[PDB]
Design a protein around this ligand. Structure first.
Ligand code: 0ST
Lengths: 266, 327
């Protein structure tokens, strides 16, 4: 609720809506070691890992989204070699949990959750046990906070979506699927490239197409750059095609080996 | 397992607070928050004083995480501004840089209180800028939760001469009666009551509800001594307060029969038919849902009456209040 209607003055908008060409140029560092296809498959993988961690810790979906953005922001500018994403993922959940005012997740509870989730739900990728201890998290939290420039408050599409479907009066029919499609967009770069309300409208449009609801009169009445929504929709449609062709469980061990590992000191 | 080149590159580039700023033995305040220092840039491309806060504890605390999160988004001339955040990796201490406020209402009032044994252009200006700062926060669903003179800073000599700056660092003098009757949650109304108490203190130089589990008997007794015991008609949902039966056990309306805010403010030489009093009464309403909002308060005709409020609270005069002593 805090800072609800401040997006156009917020640090999210002014600093963390990035240019796509700036983003891809920084990614060319990692693309020496990985394919474009393989880098996207890492994003999807670590999106699932962060989701799994938040579920294990009984955290709310907005806390999970914030953590996913922190993760995305870090590696948007920095290499996969710089800090291990296995360390960064639970660190992002730990930092987000404080910001969103649920509480300081206990040291034991975090490290057990990180151990348990990878052992249970990601043993196909990670054969060895979760090696990091709580001192590694607390160090990583300092690096994460620094790079984000202390920008902790993050706006998500779940609020504007809710407002849009209430305006339609189609909450029961459309909200479940549309909300579900908002979750999927965190697999993509969309949240670094567009304001949350624009993503929300794109998700709502796909939910309408899927359930064969007509809303052209509703959509035409909005005062938004409609061509920019068709960009977001095209990303959402392309996403579900990659999903189909991507077998996470058969591929990710080999992709994770192709990641550039960190240089230890001399 | 962290990359060495990445580690040394950041460590090289990372601005350290000890290198950038001179603050050795300039400790302006200690408290729950931590330690605050009056600082100056060593590499002298700046000669303004800066307030420099080292946070109590180690690491990114829960308290520390909220302060950083909120202040990093907030921007308004009557709310304190965060300039920079230093993360000191060695000791894991967090430093927060703010602009330096020379004065505050705790010292300003105490100075006038000492002068017995407060200009009304200044009072109106003070109140207006407080209401402007809170309206900004309340609009963004940010509550203060602990408004009092010491948290109302005022800038000294410089380009922001005499501008109020709302800040946030065991007395129940500015706490609203619903909290004393065990209200579960903080509210915008709770902030407005505290502003009413401050405005009463600015006019009289005396804390209107001076005194000394959620329940506090003697603090309630003081409120009723000044305000009078509230009628059922005045505050209907008082019955729904968790400590209502305890109130009825300990207190009797009859005790406070000759008591009113009118009668109190007459004793401290403030006319009850002035625009200043009628606004004060609207701020100091017992029922939280009968208090005017900060936006409504700014729209009061009190601020159209002569003298008009000014950006410089001091109105271009020489400032008689002494600078901050070091600790
Ligand atoms: C845990 C936590 C603590 C404080 C804040 N906070 N909140 C505010 C609002 C937005 C309410 C005006 C200001 C501050 N912190 C300071 O002003 N700091 C400047 C230092 N000053 C304060 C006044 O006393 C002297 C030092 C938030 C979260």
């Amino acid at each position: 609720k805090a800072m609800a209607g401040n997006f156009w003055q917020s640090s999210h908008y002014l600093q963390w809506i990035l240019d796509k060409q700036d983003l891809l140029k920084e990614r060319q560092k990692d693309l020496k070691f990985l394919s474009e296809e393989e880098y996207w498959k890492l994003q999807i993988f670590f999106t699932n890992v962060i989701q799994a961690l938040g579920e294990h810790l009984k955290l709310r979906q907005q806390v999970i989204a914030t953590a996913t953005v922190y993760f995305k922001r870090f590696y948007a500018r920095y290499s996969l070699k710089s800090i291990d994403p296995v360390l960064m993922a639970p660190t992002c959940v730990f930092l987000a949990s404080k910001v969103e005012e649920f509480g300081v997740v206990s040291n034991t509870r975090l490290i057990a959750a990180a151990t348990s989730v990878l052992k249970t739900r990601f043993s196909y990728a990670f054969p060895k046990e979760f090696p990091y201890r709580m001192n590694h998290i607390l160090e990583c939290e300092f690096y994460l906070l620094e790079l984000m420039d202390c920008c902790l408050i993050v706006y998500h599409p779940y609020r504007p979506l809710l407002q849009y479907v209430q305006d339609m009066g189609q909450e029961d029919m459309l909200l479940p699927l549309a909300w579900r499609i908002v979750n999927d967009t965190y697999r993509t770069d969309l949240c670094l490239l567009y304001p949350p309300f624009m993503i929300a409208l794109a998700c709502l449009h796909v939910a309408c197409v899927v359930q064969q609801k007509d809303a052209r009169q509703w959509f035409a009445e909005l005062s938004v750059d409609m061509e920019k929504i068709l960009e977001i929709i095209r990303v959402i449609l392309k996403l579900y095609e990659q999903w189909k062709n991507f077998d996470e469980r058969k591929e990710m061990a080999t992709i994770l080996s192709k990641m550039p590992k960190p240089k230890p000191p001399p | 397992k962290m990359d060495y080149d990445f580690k040394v590159k950041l460590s090289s580039e990372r601005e350290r607070v000890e290198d950038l700023f001179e603050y050795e033995g300039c400790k302006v305040g200690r408290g729950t928050y931590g330690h605050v220092y009056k600082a100056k840039r060593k590499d002298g491309k700046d000669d303004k004083d800066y307030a420099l806060k080292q946070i109590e504890g180690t690491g990114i605390s829960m308290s520390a995480c909220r302060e950083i999160a909120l202040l990093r988004e907030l921007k308004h001339p009557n709310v304190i501004s965060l300039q920079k955040v230093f993360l000191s990796h060695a000791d894991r201490k967090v430093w927060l840089l703010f602009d330096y406020a020379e004065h505050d209402l705790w010292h300003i009032i105490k100075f006038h209180r000492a002068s017995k044994a407060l200009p009304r252009g200044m009072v109106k200006s003070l109140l207006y800028q407080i209401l402007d700062g809170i309206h900004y926060l309340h609009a963004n669903w940010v509550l203060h939760r602990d408004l009092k003179p010491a948290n109302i800073l005022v800038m000294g000599e410089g380009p922001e001469r005499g501008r109020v700056k709302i800040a946030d660092m065991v007395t129940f003098w500015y706490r609203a009666p619903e909290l004393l009757l065990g209200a579960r949650h903080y509210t915008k109304a709770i902030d407005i009551w505290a502003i009413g108490c401050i405005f009463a203190e600015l006019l009289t130089s005396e804390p209107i509800f001076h005194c000394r589990n959620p329940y506090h008997h003697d603090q309630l007794d003081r409120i009723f001594n000044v305000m009078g015991f509230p009628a059922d008609k005045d505050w209907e949902d008082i019955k729904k307060m968790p400590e209502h039966s305890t109130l009825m056990k300990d207190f009797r309306r009859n005790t406070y029969t000759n008591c009113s805010l009118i009668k109190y403010m007459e004793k401290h030489k403030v006319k009850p038919d002035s625009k200043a009093f009628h606004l004060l009464q609207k701020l100091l309403t017992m029922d939280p849902i009968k208090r005017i909002t900060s936006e409504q308060a700014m729209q009061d005709p009190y601020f159209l009456e002569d003298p008009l409020p000014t950006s410089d609270v001091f109105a271009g005069c020489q400032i008689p209040y002494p600078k901050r002593e070091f600790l």
